[PDB]
Design a protein around this ligand. Structure first.
Ligand SMILES: *[B]([O])([O])[C]([C]N1[C]=C(C([O])=O)N=N1)[N]C(=O)[C]C1=[C][C]=[C]S1
Length: 265
């Protein structure tokens, strides 16, 4: 059954006018569904989930990190920073910046956290530390969104995203409290209701992080899903398309997720 999804994905790609990348893993079986699971796709804002996890990992060695106040100025602001804008007058703690980045995809917040962490190379090193050899972050918000076809900057594979997400949310890469905080942040995400969440029965708990580059039909979602009374499922859906003005589609990400889940039957 896991090998009967190729033609359904191909049709979806053809309808979409671009490329879809999927990796889904049932943590009960170990069983997987792949489709372009090894190809690079741009992360767009989906790197912010892993950023927050990296912050949490630092907090295991550094008490008082998460509650540290960051009083940023208006200069820290860039587009797509709805929470950072709203809290300009008060500042935000590292934890509040992390939640804004994950749950609202806040750009300014993500860049502030990158700066704490040693930049794109520092995040990349953290992902190496958990055994992810594919992930690379090269640039900052907003230029990491360029999504130029063939460009490996600021990309990973669906497989590596899912494997890394599993380690951090369900595996041993984070301490217990930190692990739960990561899961909670992903669970309260607000930007993903039309993506993997739309593909999942209403009764199942879901945590996710989205990404939207805004060019080259490039957008994505990754998630942990808790089917009632069963082992979690972890999955990643990434898209791109050949022309700069090709439109991304949330509906295609949801349909891709439904196929992957079906494939795990
Ligand atoms: B992220 O994907 O790197 C970032 C912030 N963002 C936009 C969205 C969305 O459009 O739903 N989610 N998160 N992307 C950008 O800042 C580039 C843009 C995407 C759309 C307009 S600008």
């Amino acid at each position: 059954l896991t090998n009967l999804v190729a033609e359904p994905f191909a049709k979806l790609e053809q309808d979409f006018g671009g490329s879809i990348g999927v990796y889904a893993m049932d943590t009960g079986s170990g069983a997987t569904v792949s489709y372009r699971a090894e190809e690079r796709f741009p992360l767009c804002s989906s790197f912010k989930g892993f950023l927050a996890a990296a912050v949490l990992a630092r907090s295991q060695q550094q008490a008082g990190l998460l509650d540290t106040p960051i009083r940023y100025g208006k200069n820290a602001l860039v587009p797509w920073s709805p929470i950072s804008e709203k809290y300009l007058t008060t500042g935000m703690t590292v934890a509040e910046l992390s939640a804004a980045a994950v749950q609202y995809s806040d750009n300014a917040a993500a860049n502030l956290l990158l700066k704490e962490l040693g930049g794109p190379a520092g995040l990349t090193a953290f992902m190496r530390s958990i055994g992810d050899t594919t992930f690379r972050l090269d640039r900052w918000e907003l230029e990491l969104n360029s999504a130029i076809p063939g460009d490996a900057r600021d990309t990973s594979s669906p497989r590596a995203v899912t494997e890394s997400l599993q380690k951090l949310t369900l595996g041993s890469a984070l301490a217990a409290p930190q692990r739960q905080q990561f899961v909670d942040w992903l669970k309260g995400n607000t930007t993903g209701n039309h993506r993997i969440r739309a593909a999942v029965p209403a009764d199942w708990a879901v945590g996710d992080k989205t990404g939207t580059c805004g060019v080259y039909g490039t957008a994505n979602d990754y998630a942990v899903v808790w089917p009632t009374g069963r082992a979690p499922i972890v999955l990643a859906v990434y898209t791109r398309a050949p022309n700069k003005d090709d439109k991304h589609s949330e509906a295609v990400i949801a349909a891709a997720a439904r196929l992957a889940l079906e494939g795990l039957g």
